Amino acid sequence: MQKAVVMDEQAIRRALTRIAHEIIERNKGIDGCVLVGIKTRGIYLARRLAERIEQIEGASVPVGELDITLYRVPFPVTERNVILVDDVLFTGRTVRAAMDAVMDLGRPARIQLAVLVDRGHRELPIRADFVGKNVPTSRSELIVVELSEVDGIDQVSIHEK
Amino acid sequence: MQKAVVMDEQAIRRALTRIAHEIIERNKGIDGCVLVGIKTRGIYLARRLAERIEQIEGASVPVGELDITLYRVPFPVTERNVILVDDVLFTGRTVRAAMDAVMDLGRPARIQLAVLVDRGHRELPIRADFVGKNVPTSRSELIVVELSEVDGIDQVSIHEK
Amino acid sequence: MQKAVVMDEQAIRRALTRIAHEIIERNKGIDGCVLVGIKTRGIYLARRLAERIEQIEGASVPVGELDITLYRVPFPVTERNVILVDDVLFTGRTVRAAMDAVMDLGRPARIQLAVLVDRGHRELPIRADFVGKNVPTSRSELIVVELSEVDGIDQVSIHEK
Amino acid sequence: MQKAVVMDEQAIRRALTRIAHEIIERNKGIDGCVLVGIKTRGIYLARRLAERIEQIEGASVPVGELDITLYRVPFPVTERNVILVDDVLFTGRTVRAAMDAVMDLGRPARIQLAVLVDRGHRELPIRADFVGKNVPTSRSELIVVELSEVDGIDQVSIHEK
């Protein structure tokens, strides 16, 4: 069941907007940049960031989709700044899988990672470059990220089964 | 003599814009917020942030100005979120004085600090909540912050003498 | 009611030992340093630190006791690196009162901050230089630090009515 | 030219000792922990950390060696806390290669990374869990790590043409 809300629609909107500005700032423009969404909600987050960047800089950013699932759609990559987008950073194992998939498709100038929430408990020396919000959790708790495009609403909560 | 430019006009713009978004985000809105610029350059930086915030939230924010030297433009304080604004965070000593002044005027809910650049070398346990850019410097180097309103251009550089 | 135990005697012991090494490391030896314990329990932590450092460096370190009650023990301050020692870093207002109290005694070369736990919720631009453990908490939760010298046991827990 | 010495023998000594306590501290001991050094100097730093951890816990930590050139030696992996050890963390591409190598030999409980120096300029979403010293650098500077076992002396410096 749901224990508590840690991000409402407004907090998610402001977080994603501030991230877009962070991406633009740390790359001095989105030139050579590419957003690649993971799983399902990461893709929707990626598309939102692309629109925000486009809205801010006037330049559009390519959005690609990556389907990990196993290994535990095409796009630029080569000599590009590949920014992975995902909803929650946990153990970090998915990112590793995602990185292999990126360099299996080319050689990027670099790979970055943007997540809506970092809930800690990393099991790999991996960190997000951009973070919507750091949400302290116990190892057993569950982070549920709901996005309007798939869940009907924007909300991040902590659950416990 | 100018040793190196660490922030050009565009970098300063993207930093101040991102900071404005960080400010609204952590405060979940502008309500109760008060920007207090510190003598000279910190004042202009507070004005620029106040404008960016207004542009973002559709509502303006109270902007006061603090002359730390004079302490040896009034504004709200009590139960307010006072965001001190300065150009460079250095030893941190100047910030303590700024805190004493703010609380001389009232009892704020919180005091925050935003600086364009944090050049390290603190001599007190004070850290900025918002930082335009962290600029490592030696103990002998000088940080020169130029703002268009006073120096004709927006630029941050490292000087040696 | 006790909601959780976040540090047992072994964790506390290992955090304190590691901090002693961090203190020596960041100051390139303990020459000119002074450990000033705050309130009540910060005094014991400072004593344990002084003892650990002594056994590591083979050189003793001055220990003072500061009561910050008035700001909310004849020890060296001026020209010294005053390392404040407290049990918990919360809003940081205790630190501001402590910095004021230290400035009424002398002119330190610099002031640092070491705490056993940082539970977040800062209301001032203050951060510890050394932290035993970051214990995320809700605003309504209480951090209880028990030390053998005063409570019969070493333990840090989270309480809430 | 050697334009700056960032770590001398004593600093390295105190940094490694501090790292050992941190490692033990975050793992609540070393039970199930394995140290794995890469390239050449990482191996030496791993042996040292291993030596330091023995004097603290009274038990040896397995030490493995990893040759990465073929990615761009025994030790248990599965269910173990594998601690990668390298001298410098730069782009982080070596670490990604090192990780693939680790999970090629098994399924560890977690993989952590310890490095003597972090010089920034990450090109992958990788971070070290234990850092001897963060040394800011320009893109054209080079980090040279000298260890007595191979270079006759312990020293970290910044070089530039």
Side-chain angles (χ1 to χ4, degrees):
Chain A
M1 74 183 287
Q2 164 168 143
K3 274 187 174 180
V5 176
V6 297
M7 287 190 92
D8 52 31
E9 147 198 343
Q10 224 178 184
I12 290 171
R13 184 188 73 236
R14 300 196 231 260
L16 295 182
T17 299
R18 177 265 298 171
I19 289 173
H21 287 277
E22 279 185 323
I23 295 172
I24 293 173
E25 183 187 6
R26 302 184 200 171
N27 298 307
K28 299 179 182 175
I30 33 60
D31 223 69
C33 291
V34 178
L35 291 164
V36 179
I38 297 180
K39 294 177 295 180
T40 307
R41 300 184 177 71
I43 297 173
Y44 282 104
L45 286 170
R47 292 177 192 176
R48 292 196 192 186
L49 291 171
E51 281 171 43
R52 273 287 165 48
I53 300 179
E54 159 99 55
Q55 165 200 181
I56 303 170
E57 297 294 280
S60 66
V61 177
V63 164
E65 303 184 8
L66 194 58
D67 187 301
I68 295 178
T69 299
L70 305 179
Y71 335 117
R72 299 194 318 180
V73 187
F75 49 84
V77 180
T78 309
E79 193 59 15
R80 289 271 220 158
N81 166 39
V82 181
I83 309 178
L84 292 172
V85 184
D86 201 352
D87 58 357
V88 178
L89 179 60
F90 191 13
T91 67
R93 294 168 180 282
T94 287
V95 177
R96 197 179 83 75
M99 285 194 275
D100 294 315
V102 177
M103 284 179 258
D104 258 33
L105 307 169
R107 293 291 286 173
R110 63 192 178 192
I111 295 174
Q112 286 179 163
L113 177 70
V115 300
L116 178 58
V117 340
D118 176 354
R119 55 160 308 194
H121 314 290
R122 218 81 66 242
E123 308 197 321
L124 295 168
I126 287 173
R127 52 61 160 290
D129 289 292
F130 309 93
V131 170
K133 172 171 185 180
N134 291 113
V135 179
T137 58
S138 66
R139 191 72 173 58
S140 60
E141 287 177 326
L142 208 203
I143 283 292
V144 170
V145 169
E146 302 175 78
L147 296 179
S148 60
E149 306 96 326
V150 172
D151 310 290
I153 58 174
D154 281 0
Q155 166 176 279
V156 181
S157 54
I158 296 176
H159 284 62
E160 190 154 71
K161 272 303 178 176
Chain B
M1 50 88 95
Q2 198 183 80
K3 192 176 196 170
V5 187
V6 287
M7 294 186 83
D8 62 3
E9 160 171 45
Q10 177 171 53
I12 292 176
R13 188 186 63 246
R14 294 204 265 240
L16 295 186
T17 294
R18 173 262 301 175
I19 284 169
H21 281 278
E22 277 183 321
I23 289 177
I24 304 166
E25 184 181 6
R26 301 190 203 180
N27 290 289
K28 298 186 168 184
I30 273 49
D31 283 33
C33 290
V34 168
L35 298 170
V36 181
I38 296 177
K39 189 198 71 64
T40 313
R41 294 175 177 64
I43 290 178
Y44 298 123
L45 295 171
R47 290 178 185 182
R48 296 189 190 196
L49 285 172
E51 275 191 47
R52 183 51 63 205
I53 290 174
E54 187 176 9
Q55 171 278 296
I56 302 175
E57 294 289 291
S60 64
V61 188
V63 174
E65 53 190 64
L66 205 66
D67 183 326
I68 297 180
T69 78
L70 285 182
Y71 185 69
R72 303 169 183 172
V73 172
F75 46 99
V77 166
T78 298
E79 212 60 356
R80 286 276 200 159
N81 161 45
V82 181
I83 304 181
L84 292 165
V85 184
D86 213 348
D87 63 344
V88 177
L89 169 55
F90 187 11
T91 74
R93 289 165 179 285
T94 249
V95 172
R96 205 172 67 82
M99 293 193 283
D100 288 311
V102 172
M103 289 194 299
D104 240 45
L105 305 177
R107 203 283 178 173
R110 60 175 61 277
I111 301 184
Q112 283 166 176
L113 167 64
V115 297
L116 178 60
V117 327
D118 176 349
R119 61 164 297 188
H121 301 288
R122 61 178 178 287
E123 294 182 4
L124 294 180
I126 290 183
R127 300 277 56 191
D129 297 297
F130 310 95
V131 173
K133 178 177 190 176
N134 289 96
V135 183
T137 52
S138 70
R139 199 119 164 64
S140 297
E141 298 174 319
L142 310 147
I143 283 293
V144 170
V145 170
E146 303 176 78
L147 296 179
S148 59
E149 305 96 326
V150 172
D151 310 290
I153 58 174
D154 281 0
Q155 166 176 278
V156 181
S157 54
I158 296 176
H159 284 61
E160 184 174 68
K161 201 71 173 181
Chain C
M1 167 181 45
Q2 195 199 78
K3 287 294 185 61
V5 169
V6 297
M7 295 190 94
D8 67 342
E9 178 186 60
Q10 189 165 63
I12 287 168
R13 188 204 79 200
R14 285 202 270 249
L16 293 178
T17 296
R18 175 213 104 219
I19 286 172
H21 285 278
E22 269 177 351
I23 295 173
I24 301 173
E25 186 185 13
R26 260 178 260 184
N27 292 290
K28 295 177 167 289
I30 42 60
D31 279 30
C33 298
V34 181
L35 300 173
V36 185
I38 298 179
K39 62 142 197 165
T40 56
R41 297 186 170 69
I43 299 180
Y44 296 118
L45 296 167
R47 296 179 177 177
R48 299 192 186 185
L49 287 178
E51 189 175 70
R52 307 290 189 66
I53 298 175
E54 210 177 78
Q55 251 105 292
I56 299 171
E57 295 304 277
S60 195
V61 176
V63 180
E65 299 179 2
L66 192 73
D67 180 304
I68 66 172
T69 321
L70 291 180
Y71 298 87
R72 283 174 161 294
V73 178
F75 59 81
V77 167
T78 305
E79 228 63 50
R80 293 301 184 79
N81 167 46
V82 177
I83 301 180
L84 292 175
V85 187
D86 209 351
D87 64 335
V88 180
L89 174 52
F90 193 6
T91 61
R93 291 166 186 276
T94 56
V95 182
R96 180 202 134 58
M99 290 195 288
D100 288 342
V102 164
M103 292 305 184
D104 269 358
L105 300 175
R107 290 287 171 276
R110 70 196 313 312
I111 299 172
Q112 304 190 103
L113 181 55
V115 305
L116 180 63
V117 37
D118 177 357
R119 61 166 298 189
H121 302 286
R122 217 75 71 254
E123 300 190 334
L124 299 180
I126 298 176
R127 308 287 153 168
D129 296 286
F130 310 102
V131 177
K133 176 174 191 173
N134 292 120
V135 179
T137 61
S138 68
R139 195 60 170 60
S140 54
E141 292 183 314
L142 199 193
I143 283 292
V144 170
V145 170
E146 303 176 77
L147 296 179
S148 60
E149 305 97 328
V150 171
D151 310 290
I153 58 174
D154 280 2
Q155 166 176 280
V156 181
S157 53
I158 295 176
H159 285 62
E160 180 162 56
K161 183 179 180 175
Chain D
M1 179 190 285
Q2 182 186 70
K3 68 118 73 79
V5 173
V6 163
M7 295 187 96
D8 69 342
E9 178 174 56
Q10 189 164 62
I12 293 174
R13 177 169 60 259
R14 293 198 271 228
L16 285 175
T17 295
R18 187 213 77 224
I19 288 180
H21 290 266
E22 275 186 332
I23 288 178
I24 298 170
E25 186 196 12
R26 299 190 191 175
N27 295 298
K28 299 181 185 184
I30 45 176
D31 193 332
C33 293
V34 170
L35 289 170
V36 187
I38 58 188
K39 291 161 193 164
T40 298
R41 293 177 173 62
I43 299 174
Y44 289 120
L45 291 172
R47 291 168 180 180
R48 300 197 185 191
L49 286 177
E51 177 175 352
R52 284 179 159 75
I53 294 177
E54 253 189 59
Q55 339 282 276
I56 306 176
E57 298 303 295
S60 80
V61 180
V63 174
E65 305 185 358
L66 201 59
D67 185 296
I68 297 301
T69 304
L70 36 286
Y71 272 107
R72 190 184 185 184
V73 285
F75 62 87
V77 171
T78 303
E79 207 71 7
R80 293 289 188 298
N81 182 311
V82 176
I83 302 177
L84 291 176
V85 182
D86 205 357
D87 56 342
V88 183
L89 170 59
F90 190 12
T91 60
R93 293 167 184 282
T94 285
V95 179
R96 167 185 154 64
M99 284 197 287
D100 297 319
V102 173
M103 286 175 266
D104 222 56
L105 297 178
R107 269 244 39 186
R110 74 187 46 249
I111 297 178
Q112 289 174 165
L113 171 63
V115 299
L116 182 63
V117 40
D118 180 345
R119 66 160 298 190
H121 302 290
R122 211 72 69 243
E123 273 176 32
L124 297 182
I126 294 179
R127 74 182 176 196
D129 297 290
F130 313 93
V131 185
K133 175 171 187 176
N134 296 293
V135 185
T137 61
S138 75
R139 200 71 190 62
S140 68
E141 297 176 320
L142 201 205
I143 284 292
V144 170
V145 170
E146 302 176 78
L147 295 179
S148 60
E149 305 97 326
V150 172
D151 310 290
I153 58 174
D154 281 0
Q155 166 175 278
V156 181
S157 54
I158 296 177
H159 284 63
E160 179 163 57
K161 193 178 61 182

Short mmCIF file of all heavy atoms in Angstrom, two decimals, chain A residues 18-40:
data_model
loop_
_atom_site.label_atom_id
_atom_site.label_comp_id
_atom_site.label_asym_id
_atom_site.label_seq_id
_atom_site.Cartn_x
_atom_site.Cartn_y
_atom_site.Cartn_z
N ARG A 18 13.70 22.39 -14.16
CA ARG A 18 15.02 22.76 -13.67
C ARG A 18 16.10 21.84 -14.26
O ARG A 18 17.24 22.26 -14.48
CB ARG A 18 15.03 22.71 -12.14
CG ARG A 18 16.37 23.01 -11.51
CD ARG A 18 17.11 21.74 -11.22
NE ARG A 18 16.38 20.91 -10.27
CZ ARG A 18 16.71 19.66 -9.96
NH1 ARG A 18 17.77 19.10 -10.54
NH2 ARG A 18 16.00 18.97 -9.09
N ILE A 19 15.73 20.59 -14.52
CA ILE A 19 16.68 19.64 -15.09
C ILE A 19 17.03 20.04 -16.52
O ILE A 19 18.19 20.00 -16.92
CB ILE A 19 16.11 18.21 -15.07
CG1 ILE A 19 16.07 17.70 -13.63
CG2 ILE A 19 16.94 17.29 -15.97
CD1 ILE A 19 15.36 16.36 -13.44
N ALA A 20 16.01 20.43 -17.28
CA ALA A 20 16.21 20.86 -18.66
C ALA A 20 17.25 21.99 -18.68
O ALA A 20 18.17 21.98 -19.49
CB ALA A 20 14.91 21.35 -19.26
N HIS A 21 17.08 22.97 -17.78
CA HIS A 21 18.01 24.09 -17.71
C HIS A 21 19.41 23.61 -17.31
O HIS A 21 20.42 24.13 -17.81
CB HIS A 21 17.49 25.13 -16.71
CG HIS A 21 16.32 25.92 -17.22
ND1 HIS A 21 16.46 27.03 -18.03
CD2 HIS A 21 14.99 25.76 -17.04
CE1 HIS A 21 15.27 27.51 -18.33
NE2 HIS A 21 14.36 26.76 -17.74
N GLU A 22 19.47 22.61 -16.44
CA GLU A 22 20.75 22.06 -16.01
C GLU A 22 21.46 21.40 -17.18
O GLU A 22 22.66 21.57 -17.37
CB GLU A 22 20.55 21.04 -14.88
CG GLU A 22 20.37 21.68 -13.52
CD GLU A 22 20.29 20.65 -12.40
OE1 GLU A 22 19.70 19.57 -12.60
OE2 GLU A 22 20.82 20.94 -11.31
N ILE A 23 20.71 20.64 -17.97
CA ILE A 23 21.29 19.96 -19.13
C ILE A 23 21.84 21.00 -20.11
O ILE A 23 22.97 20.87 -20.58
CB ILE A 23 20.23 19.09 -19.85
CG1 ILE A 23 19.79 17.95 -18.92
CG2 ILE A 23 20.80 18.54 -21.15
CD1 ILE A 23 18.62 17.13 -19.44
N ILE A 24 21.05 22.02 -20.41
CA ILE A 24 21.48 23.06 -21.33
C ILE A 24 22.72 23.78 -20.83
O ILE A 24 23.65 24.05 -21.58
CB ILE A 24 20.36 24.11 -21.55
CG1 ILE A 24 19.18 23.45 -22.28
CG2 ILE A 24 20.89 25.31 -22.32
CD1 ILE A 24 17.97 24.35 -22.39
N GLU A 25 22.73 24.07 -19.53
CA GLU A 25 23.84 24.77 -18.89
C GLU A 25 25.15 23.99 -18.92
O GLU A 25 26.19 24.52 -19.29
CB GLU A 25 23.48 25.11 -17.44
CG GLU A 25 24.53 25.90 -16.70
CD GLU A 25 24.20 26.07 -15.22
OE1 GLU A 25 23.21 25.47 -14.75
OE2 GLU A 25 24.94 26.79 -14.52
N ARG A 26 25.10 22.71 -18.53
CA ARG A 26 26.30 21.88 -18.49
C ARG A 26 26.81 21.39 -19.84
O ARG A 26 27.84 20.71 -19.91
CB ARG A 26 26.08 20.68 -17.57
CG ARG A 26 25.70 21.06 -16.16
CD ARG A 26 25.59 19.84 -15.27
NE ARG A 26 24.81 20.09 -14.07
CZ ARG A 26 24.42 19.14 -13.22
NH1 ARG A 26 24.74 17.87 -13.47
NH2 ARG A 26 23.70 19.45 -12.15
N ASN A 27 26.10 21.73 -20.90
CA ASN A 27 26.50 21.33 -22.24
C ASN A 27 26.62 22.57 -23.11
O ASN A 27 26.95 22.49 -24.29
CB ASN A 27 25.47 20.36 -22.83
CG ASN A 27 25.36 19.08 -22.03
OD1 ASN A 27 26.36 18.41 -21.77
ND2 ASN A 27 24.14 18.72 -21.64
N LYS A 28 26.34 23.73 -22.51
CA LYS A 28 26.41 25.00 -23.21
C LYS A 28 25.63 24.91 -24.51
O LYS A 28 26.15 25.22 -25.58
CB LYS A 28 27.87 25.36 -23.48
CG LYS A 28 28.70 25.51 -22.22
CD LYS A 28 30.15 25.83 -22.53
CE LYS A 28 30.97 25.93 -21.26
NZ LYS A 28 32.42 26.13 -21.56
N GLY A 29 24.37 24.49 -24.39
CA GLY A 29 23.52 24.31 -25.54
C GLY A 29 23.33 22.82 -25.71
O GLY A 29 24.11 22.03 -25.17
N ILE A 30 22.31 22.40 -26.46
CA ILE A 30 22.07 20.98 -26.65
C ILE A 30 22.72 20.41 -27.91
O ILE A 30 22.44 19.27 -28.30
CB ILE A 30 20.56 20.66 -26.69
CG1 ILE A 30 19.80 21.83 -27.32
CG2 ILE A 30 20.07 20.36 -25.29
CD1 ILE A 30 20.21 22.16 -28.73
N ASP A 31 23.58 21.20 -28.53
CA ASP A 31 24.26 20.76 -29.73
C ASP A 31 24.98 19.44 -29.48
O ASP A 31 25.74 19.31 -28.51
CB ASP A 31 25.28 21.80 -30.18
CG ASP A 31 25.25 22.02 -31.68
OD1 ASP A 31 24.24 22.57 -32.17
OD2 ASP A 31 26.22 21.63 -32.36
N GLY A 32 24.73 18.46 -30.34
CA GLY A 32 25.37 17.17 -30.20
C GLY A 32 24.75 16.32 -29.12
O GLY A 32 25.19 15.20 -28.86
N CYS A 33 23.71 16.84 -28.47
CA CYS A 33 23.04 16.11 -27.41
C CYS A 33 21.90 15.25 -27.92
O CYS A 33 21.25 15.58 -28.91
CB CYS A 33 22.51 17.07 -26.35
SG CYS A 33 23.81 17.87 -25.37
N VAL A 34 21.67 14.15 -27.22
CA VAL A 34 20.61 13.22 -27.57
C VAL A 34 20.01 12.60 -26.32
O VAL A 34 20.74 12.12 -25.45
CB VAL A 34 21.14 12.10 -28.47
CG1 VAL A 34 20.03 11.12 -28.80
CG2 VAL A 34 21.71 12.70 -29.74
N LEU A 35 18.69 12.62 -26.23
CA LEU A 35 18.00 12.06 -25.08
C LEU A 35 17.53 10.64 -25.38
O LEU A 35 16.84 10.41 -26.37
CB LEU A 35 16.80 12.93 -24.71
CG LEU A 35 17.11 14.31 -24.13
CD1 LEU A 35 15.87 15.18 -24.17
CD2 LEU A 35 17.61 14.16 -22.70
N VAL A 36 17.92 9.69 -24.54
CA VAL A 36 17.50 8.30 -24.72
C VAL A 36 16.76 7.78 -23.49
O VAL A 36 17.36 7.54 -22.44
CB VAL A 36 18.71 7.38 -24.99
CG1 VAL A 36 18.24 5.94 -25.16
CG2 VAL A 36 19.45 7.84 -26.24
N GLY A 37 15.45 7.59 -23.64
CA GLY A 37 14.64 7.10 -22.53
C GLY A 37 14.69 5.60 -22.33
O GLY A 37 14.69 4.83 -23.29
N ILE A 38 14.73 5.18 -21.06
CA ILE A 38 14.77 3.76 -20.69
C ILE A 38 13.37 3.25 -20.33
O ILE A 38 12.42 4.02 -20.20
CB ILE A 38 15.71 3.53 -19.49
CG1 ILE A 38 17.14 3.90 -19.87
CG2 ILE A 38 15.70 2.08 -19.06
CD1 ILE A 38 18.13 3.71 -18.74
N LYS A 39 13.25 1.93 -20.17
CA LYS A 39 11.98 1.28 -19.82
C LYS A 39 10.84 2.01 -20.50
O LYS A 39 10.95 2.39 -21.67
CB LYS A 39 11.79 1.28 -18.30
CG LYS A 39 12.80 0.41 -17.53
CD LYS A 39 12.61 0.48 -16.01
CE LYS A 39 12.91 1.88 -15.47
NZ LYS A 39 12.74 2.00 -13.99
N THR A 40 9.75 2.24 -19.77
CA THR A 40 8.59 2.92 -20.33
C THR A 40 8.44 4.37 -19.88
O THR A 40 8.28 5.28 -20.69
CB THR A 40 7.30 2.17 -19.96
OG1 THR A 40 7.42 0.79 -20.33
CG2 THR A 40 6.10 2.79 -20.67
#
